[PDB]
Amino acid sequence: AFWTQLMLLLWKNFMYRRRQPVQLLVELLWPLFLFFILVAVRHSHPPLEHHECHFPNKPLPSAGTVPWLQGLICNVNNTCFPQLTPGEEPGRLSNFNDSLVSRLLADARTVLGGASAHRTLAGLGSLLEAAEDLAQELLALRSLVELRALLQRPRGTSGPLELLSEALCSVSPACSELIGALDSHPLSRLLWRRLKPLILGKLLFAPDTPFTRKLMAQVNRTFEELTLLRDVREVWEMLGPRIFTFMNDSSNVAMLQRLLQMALRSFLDPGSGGYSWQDAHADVGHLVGTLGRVTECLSLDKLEAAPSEAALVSRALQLLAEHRFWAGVVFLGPETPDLGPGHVRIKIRMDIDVVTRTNKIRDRFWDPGPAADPLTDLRYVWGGFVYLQDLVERAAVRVLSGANPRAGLYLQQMPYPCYVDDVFLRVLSRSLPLFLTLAWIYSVTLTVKAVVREKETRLRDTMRAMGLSRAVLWLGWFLSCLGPFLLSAALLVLVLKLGDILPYSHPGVVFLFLAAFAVATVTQSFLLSAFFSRANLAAACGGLAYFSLYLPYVLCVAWRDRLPAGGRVAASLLSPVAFGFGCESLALLEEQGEGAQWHNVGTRPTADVFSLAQVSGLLLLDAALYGLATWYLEAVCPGQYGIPEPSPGVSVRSLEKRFPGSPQPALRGLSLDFYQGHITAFLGHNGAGKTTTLSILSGLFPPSGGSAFILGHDVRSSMAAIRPHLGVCPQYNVLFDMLTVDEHVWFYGRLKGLSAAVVGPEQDRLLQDVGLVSKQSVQTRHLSGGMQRKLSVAIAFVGGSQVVILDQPTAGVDPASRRGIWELLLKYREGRTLILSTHHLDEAELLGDRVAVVAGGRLCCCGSPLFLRRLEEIFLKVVEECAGRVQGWALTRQQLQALLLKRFLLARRSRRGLFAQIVLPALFVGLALVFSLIVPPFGHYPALRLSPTMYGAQVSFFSEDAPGDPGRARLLEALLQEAGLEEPPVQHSSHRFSAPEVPAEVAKVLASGNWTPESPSPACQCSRPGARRLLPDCPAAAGGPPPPQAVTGSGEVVQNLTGRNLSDFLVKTYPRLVRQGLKTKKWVNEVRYGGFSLGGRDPGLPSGQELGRSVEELWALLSPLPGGALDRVLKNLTAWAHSLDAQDSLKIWFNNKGWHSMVAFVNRASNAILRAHLPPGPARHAHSITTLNHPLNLTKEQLSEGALMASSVDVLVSICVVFAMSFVPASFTLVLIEERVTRAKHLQLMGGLSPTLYWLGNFLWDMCNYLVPACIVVLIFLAFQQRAYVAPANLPALLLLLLLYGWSITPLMYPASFFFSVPSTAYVVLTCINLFIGINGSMATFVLELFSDQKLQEVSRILKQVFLIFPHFCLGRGLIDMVRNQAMADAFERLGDRQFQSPLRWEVVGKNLLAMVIQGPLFLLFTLLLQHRSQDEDVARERERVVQGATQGDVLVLRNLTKVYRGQRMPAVDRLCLGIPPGECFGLLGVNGAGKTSTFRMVTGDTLASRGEAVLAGHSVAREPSAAHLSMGYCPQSDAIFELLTGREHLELLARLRGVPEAQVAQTAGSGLARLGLSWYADRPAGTYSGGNKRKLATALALVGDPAVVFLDQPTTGMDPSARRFLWNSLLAVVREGRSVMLTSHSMEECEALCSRLAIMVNGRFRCLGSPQHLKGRFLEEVFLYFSKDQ
Ligand SMILES: *[C@@H]1O[C@H](CO)[C@@H](O[C@@H]2O[C@H](CO)[C@@H](O[C@@H]3O[C@H](CO)[C@@H](O)[C@H](O)[C@@H]3O)[C@H](O)[C@H]2NC(C)=O)[C@H](O)[C@H]1NC(C)=O
Ligand SMILES: Nc1ncnc2c1ncn2[C@@H]1O[C@H](COP(=O)(O)OP(=O)(O)OP(=O)(O)O)[C@@H](O)[C@H]1O
Ligand SMILES: Nc1ncnc2c1ncn2[C@@H]1O[C@H](COP(=O)(O)OP(=O)(O)OP(=O)(O)O)[C@@H](O)[C@H]1O
Ligand SMILES: *[C@@H]1O[C@H](CO)[C@@H](O[C@@H]2O[C@H](CO)[C@@H](O)[C@H](O)[C@H]2NC(C)=O)[C@H](O)[C@H]1NC(C)=O
Ligand SMILES: *[C@@H]1O[C@H](CO)[C@@H](O)[C@H](O)[C@H]1NC(C)=O
Ligand SMILES: *[C@@H]1O[C@H](CO)[C@@H](O)[C@H](O)[C@H]1NC(C)=O
Ligand SMILES: *[C@@H]1O[C@H](CO)[C@@H](O)[C@H](O)[C@H]1NC(C)=O
Ligand SMILES: *[C@@H]1O[C@H](CO)[C@@H](O)[C@H](O)[C@H]1NC(C)=O
Ligand SMILES: *[C@@H]1O[C@H](CO)[C@@H](O)[C@H](O)[C@H]1NC(C)=O
Ligand SMILES: *[C@@H]1O[C@H](CO)[C@@H](O)[C@H](O)[C@H]1NC(C)=O
Ligand SMILES: [Mg+2]
Ligand SMILES: [Mg+2]
């Protein structure tokens, strides 16, 4: 019956799914909200493609001084123009052109060279004519006019820097004052804030050898020449007064000058003196003063000294504090490459904030783009490393060679092709694993809760007792839970693929991966649900254990290096870790732009060696391991309801049971024997232990000793041969809520073993025999006690049961159905060994062929009924043989002191629950910090020698221009010999370069085209706009009409590239290397890293040398002063004029894709220059220069200025703490719901408690239980020294945040306690809702506010203020803003600006606090508002009297009461009128379906009415519920007690709440306990009583305190004759006192014989309403039946 049982289980699960569809829909739609938000954001963030653009030139200080400053000031940004920059042209050399300074210099050159001979002749002494001719062209130029216009600009704008940039580029206390004026504009302050160390620096060298002194003297030349401004200012200062005196009072000389004159504008220039003697003088004076201040800005004393390297490091550490460090050069002594001098080793040390990190030679991932960010990529330019290296290297070359080389190095970045990027893919790749792991948290918790709840209510054990096998049940659970997971995974795959989040991947492999993940999760949940045995405890520790298995993934991704593959494999056993590895592999495959379309299953040999074909096998292995572990754990440890762990049909011998809680054993020893087919009956007093014995016979409990045999087998050990031979009937019915009676019987009959053919007749026969045939399409949750009991006994009798045990077959059942019970028992008595147990003696004597009585755990006597006769009286004899008011505000003080005490007691018995509910979430945060704070230590950045030999094979350049010079040829051959290509011998003088062969098709295409090097040779390539398929441009074979002349060397290849355009070659060829390199797509072996270009064209006019002649022809005359100031300025003018001719350029093309690229090529260029200028000889290797790079020992890390917060450990810890604090405000509803459901809260509300006091007491207790997690969180943060969160500056913010979150979350979970029926489901649902609304709101807004800034910043600002109603959001954003502000403050402190903000601000945390405080108590007000939502002939004569007459004596008056069960056609209760006077024990009988309990619930106040009224002592229950509730007592059919408290606590609590004085509380409780026979069991917890004791306790809580009217419901459902005698005596006493009773039952005596006014009720209508003797006279069980048949 394996397949039949499987079909039955699947059908039942399908029926449950179909009955309630909303839960199915919400489960299927839960894990997609965050992905929906992500897709919505992505839809509005189109991919961006960048146009082609070329980068500009960058001169080095070796090329001069003016161009160096020009390139430093103008080219701050890497503004790349799409049009070709003039610098890239081989002929051109000066990118900056037609500017003010360049035009001024050129025009000055021209004017000075034009008439040098004329001024020489003038100085020889006509000359006036030559001077006039020169002055004629001194006005033709407009450069002087524009210079005057610029220097006359009114002062303002941003400062001198703006005018300096305008002049250079193309469209001392005073110095400090200028800086302070300039810093007001951050745009103008960019230059200062990037160039602070250049003005203030110190150059330090460790050795003090005179060789190093010569090196520094050679370095010092540029600083020496920079100070000519002081000398020229002094010269003008000396000339000032002299010319000022000469001009004044010299009219005679001037007039004789005009007399000797005898063009015209020159003659009129001295006229009136307005335009000659002051304007030009003032302008030149202002200019010289300005340059004097400029030269006084500099310190001019940059160099310093140091004894050794230790003193160097100490002085560096001292000087680093006050912004004075710019150097560190060390002339280390290798003595080493080889013997002999010239093997100098320069080792530059500089701060880590300025030099690129040397950890990585290249980048990490192939990101398409030139990577030319002028703020975080080109650090070597704005830092000054390259300038210092060039200066030191040129000085070393000058010292070693002894010559005067002239070769100005330049820098040029090659262009980059068109491309398109997807930033969103990289952004989401980091946070995908967290999203995916957090998506499936609903289903795991619900699965664990469902499993533990099914195993808790004995439903699983009862279902298994009839023949179910554990394997079948487990497989059914597996399939049923696995279904929705697979459907949801398929839907998620579909939505991911359709949304273009993962466009490349084929959905099949992704779906298989997700299905494997889902299977692993299912089996993990089934394993996790095997430790616990209580619904509350299992629900509490259900999400923490799942989410605590994901942190090791973070630990193992932080420790990526130094990790053996064995460790990764051993840490991949946990499912979330393996899924994280798989998700990372898939994300990196997607980012590579190659997809996973069924052929990428053995790829990725990198650090992420795992691909999406090895993780799935691991996941399946983990699922198998978890399943085996679950099976073993279930087999070895059953749980609370411990199943056994591997013709006298029934026999028990020496059977005893011992519960740990009870000091005395329940059972001592039994020897009872069972027989063939004689109905046996158990008789005994309450607490004898018949139900415990019956459970011991079944598999519910294990015996504490002895053994029990059934059908010759043994329930001990081998009980597997018992299942098809047993039938069970628990005292408390266990049934499926949704399934109806017909489905119940069909399911149990099929499971029992009946064939599919014999079902209908048997089921119908049993259903008719029992008496339930009138109802067949109603679910069991709409049935009263009697119908449920009849259904339970019917289910017990379904199928062929060899031995069946009946326990309380009838209870609350009228005799009419008891007759059907009798006939059912008689019809099956032939061999089925019927066993019975009831308190009714008539049934025992009528059926019992042998009666056995047990008392006090011992078999008193067993035998035939005739044996004992020689029945109620003798059984009772045997059992006997064996056995003012405090009123006012003071009362308000008392009530609370009771109520809170109750809570405290409920907290003392169950400490494990509190430990797991209000402590464990705090320790989860500590575990998160422990696992997220362990990082690998770092030491020092290693030193490396900078040369391109560390890259590998590559491609160089050879471009040359103007070959008609020997020096350029020598330098070029030096470059070739340095590259590695040795000089070929005489036989290969011209056999050096091997030109490859052009393809035939390309050759034909070029023949159809033009073979012109100075025209665009390559064909145009198509740009690809988005389209997600082709990122780079479309390649072609037309790039370069000749193939490059590749010549191999010792590992490198050098080409020719002479005469070609040289700009299109790289652009057209790069996409070929882009597409060719696909194996790794992270560290692709690019072949083009850099090259040279020897442009020998000199940007000097041929007349420039003439300038020097002019200067020297001014030196001989004018009496050169011996002081030397004039002499020295004239000789630095002559030197500048001579150097204006220059020698050549050595332009360097560098690729920024390789980090350490420009420095190595500068090194090689300088080494080649040295080898060129060296005299010929075999000492080529004897003299070599190497540049190192080693940052200081100062312990810091690379400051990522551009990279802001990017979903890091900070937000991880914030998510962890939010998760931990979301669980705590859910344990507060368990007790509330448990009280409301069992109708125990309403008892207290009857006691005299106003709802307001109840709610305030609960609120205070819940508040007192919230401060325990917060203290532990604060202590953990303090212990771990988390500066970001806890510190003497931000501690008040955290304290207020936690305290007010506690203040405002608690009164929000109260309204949810009205609409739930089982506590654990409410617990898990509220926990999941809190988790979702917190995380997926706050962290989603955080993701929105970062990364993309396309007005999504404005969208996030809009959404931020809206999410203030939820008190969960006020903890997420608050704990992220603090971290962000702390990070910004730390960055400012590291920078040195020393700016500190404030934690508590309006726009930081203040608004959240204010809003959450103001919304705090509104939820409590809503809670109270929702709580106060409710705003014959005798019968006819009685109705007429009630309608018209007004009996003031009567206490309770009913007026036409009726109410319908939400459309059940015939109203159960309708049109009732009655009047009761004081001091009459009213009674009311009926049948199972009359509606007695409905009448009690309608009149007592538990349910709201429909029509009519129920007035109780003046105040109506509906009009004023409080006044009616003031004085009455209740006892419902379903007993209302607390499982953990005891009886004495119950009585004392009710006594205190009613208002009795404190002194008499104990006396009243003792009297109440002793009155009803409850004393020997008045200290044990109320949860361990049996049915009779619980009934007695429930009755006792209805009479304590002497109320007015007692609304006793059926009180004798299971009480014993002694107990019922006690109850009758108590009722007689209370009615003698003068208080009425409204007992209703099916029994006799006080209900019937001692009653006062019976009233039979059938189908919601009264029948007689007459006295008992009156009923007997006019018309006792048979009399009642006759009267029922009378009408
Ligand atoms: C080396 O090859 C480059 C190709 O990149 C040549 O530059 C190209 O020069 C032509 C000159 O006509 C440019 O055409 C112009 O395009 C603009 C675009 O708006 C148009 O408005 C003009 O009317 C003109 O047609 C072309 O854009 C430009 N290519 C670029 C910038 O990528 C360069 O001249 C070659 N070197 C030589 C021939 O020495
Ligand atoms: N779970 C339990 N833990 C500890 N003691 C228990 C437990 N259940 C019952 N007992 C105790 O064991 C004894 C046997 O009483 P038991 O509950 O078995 O009676 P019963 O057969 O159900 O009787 P009744 O006919 O009155 O319903 C009592 O003292 C009872 O308090
Ligand atoms: N939840 C429900 N939904 C629909 N009908 C119900 C529901 N509960 C009870 N009924 C029906 O409404 C009527 C009211 O009966 P009620 O529940 O008051 O039982 P009772 O006969 O007074 O109790 P007892 O079973 O203890 O003798 C009955 O016909 C019953 O079958
Ligand atoms: C690289 O190619 C150029 C192509 O011009 C070579 O320069 C030519 O060299 C030959 C022989 O030396 C001369 O006859 C030509 O006159 C040169 N060209 C021009 C325009 O003058 C150059 O020699 C090649 N590189 C090397 C190292 O040989
Ligand atoms: C460089 O970029 C900054 C920042 O966008 C901008 O303000 C400035 O105008 C740009 N150009 C120059 C020459 O600084
Ligand atoms: C740019 O420089 C060249 C160099 O000779 C010069 O001829 C030209 O006038 C300058 N200005 C331009 C091209 O606008
Ligand atoms: C000479 O200087 C005096 C002031 O020092 C001035 O008043 C006078 O005008 C000057 N003379 C000439 C001719 O500039
Ligand atoms: C370097 O030049 C500066 C000029 O101010 C000065 O310290 C000195 O002349 C030189 N120092 C040397 C040669 O050590
Ligand atoms: C330039 O002038 C400075 C002093 O102003 C002098 O030290 C230096 O030697 C001069 N230049 C040359 C090449 O002599
Ligand atoms: C940095 O200084 C520490 C001082 O304890 C020393 O142990 C370490 O070796 C130094 N590192 C380097 C690279 O000099
Ligand atoms: Mg019992
Ligand atoms: Mg009832």
mmCIF file of C-alpha atoms and ligand atoms in Angstrom, residues 205 213 216-217 220 223-224 299-303, ligand 8:
data_model
loop_
_atom_site.group_PDB
_atom_site.id
_atom_site.type_symbol
_atom_site.label_atom_id
_atom_site.label_comp_id
_atom_site.label_asym_id
_atom_site.label_seq_id
_atom_site.Cartn_x
_atom_site.Cartn_y
_atom_site.Cartn_z
ATOM 1 C CA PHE A 205 69.216 61.541 0.506
ATOM 2 C CA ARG A 213 76.765 65.859 -3.279
ATOM 3 C CA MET A 216 72.415 66.931 -5.764
ATOM 4 C CA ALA A 217 74.352 69.902 -7.148
ATOM 5 C CA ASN A 220 69.827 71.841 -7.957
ATOM 6 C CA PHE A 223 65.986 75.556 -8.585
ATOM 7 C CA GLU A 224 69.000 77.819 -9.115
ATOM 8 C CA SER A 299 61.049 78.440 -0.298
ATOM 9 C CA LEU A 300 64.077 78.026 -2.644
ATOM 10 C CA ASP A 301 65.641 75.678 -0.028
ATOM 11 C CA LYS A 302 64.036 72.375 -0.993
ATOM 12 C CA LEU A 303 67.107 70.183 -0.507
HETATM 13 C C1 LIG B 8 70.972 74.328 -3.754
HETATM 14 O O1 LIG B 8 70.436 75.568 -4.141
HETATM 15 C C2 LIG B 8 69.865 76.262 -3.025
HETATM 16 C C3 LIG B 8 69.435 77.620 -3.526
HETATM 17 O O2 LIG B 8 68.589 78.271 -2.590
HETATM 18 C C4 LIG B 8 70.871 76.340 -1.875
HETATM 19 O O3 LIG B 8 70.428 75.510 -0.807
HETATM 20 C C5 LIG B 8 72.272 75.922 -2.313
HETATM 21 O O4 LIG B 8 72.808 76.890 -3.208
HETATM 22 C C6 LIG B 8 72.273 74.551 -2.993
HETATM 23 N N1 LIG B 8 72.497 73.495 -2.019
HETATM 24 C C7 LIG B 8 73.491 72.606 -2.117
HETATM 25 C C8 LIG B 8 74.393 72.753 -3.306
HETATM 26 O O5 LIG B 8 73.657 71.723 -1.282
#
